[PDB]
Design a protein around this ligand. Sequence first.
Ligand SMILES: *C(=O)[C@@H]([C@@H]1NC(C(=O)O)=C(S[C@@H]2CN[C@H](C(=O)N(C)C)C2)[C@@H]1C)[C@@H](C)O
Length: 270
Amino acid sequence: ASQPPQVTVDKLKRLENDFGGRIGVYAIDTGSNKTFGYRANERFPLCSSFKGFLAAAVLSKSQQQEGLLNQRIRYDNRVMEPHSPVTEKQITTGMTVAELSAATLQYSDNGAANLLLEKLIGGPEGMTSFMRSIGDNVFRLDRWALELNSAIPGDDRDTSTPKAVAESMQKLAFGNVLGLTERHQLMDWFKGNTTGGARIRASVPANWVVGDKTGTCGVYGTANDYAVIWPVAHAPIVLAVYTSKPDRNSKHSDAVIADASRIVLESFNI
Ligand SMILES: *C(=O)[C@@H]([C@@H]1NC(C(=O)O)=C(S[C@@H]2CN[C@H](C(=O)N(C)C)C2)[C@@H]1C)[C@@H](C)O
């Protein structure tokens, strides 16, 4: 009963032609294990979207270090990165590791990302090592939170593929690499993301549940979203949508990401 893959490809190519850039997608039906990809093994900049996996890396560490999520981190006199809306308000109080994780995922707080990278996960190298440890041999993080967003065509730094992003999200959400407590916490964080209203969430009926993490590099029309989607009485779908444009000075398009998501999800004929 699903749509022929070439129909879905044909629709995405027309969308690409309209957008004036490149669209890469991969989707997994976790109940039938049917999959769909388009440019699925092409590399795209992660932008801020790595932060969902950063939160996962923190939970993995906490599964081995009792009470890590409750540890308070203070950062008096630190120069905070732009787009740090949570951490810039909690300097006097400090934040716990759980609060920093929730902030980096749900608000795309760069300060929180770099705090967790510096103090817990071992920098871009350590973030990459965590992804290797779950069998993702594609992901790479090379730079810290601000600098990783240059999105230059041809530069493989701070990139992954739609396939690898979706496959790693499926592992973390539903597989064995995290314990039950940790899976549940990760999915609750994704469900409460606040930055994705115009992307994958905008492609699904309002009574479906979504957890997602976005990225918006701010250059080269480069932006993305990946998600777990729970349709009504259907197995969850994992979806990654990555985009870029050839011109440095172009703007990204939220609508193209929502439209690509819609095409892909409709192809499963849920
Ligand atoms: C990461 O890519 C950058 C930040 N992360 C994201 C994002 O997750 O999309 C943005 S875009 C920001 C959040 N949502 C706002 C929005 O949608 N409107 C104001 C319509 C804008 C950040 C810039 C990071 C490198 O800073």
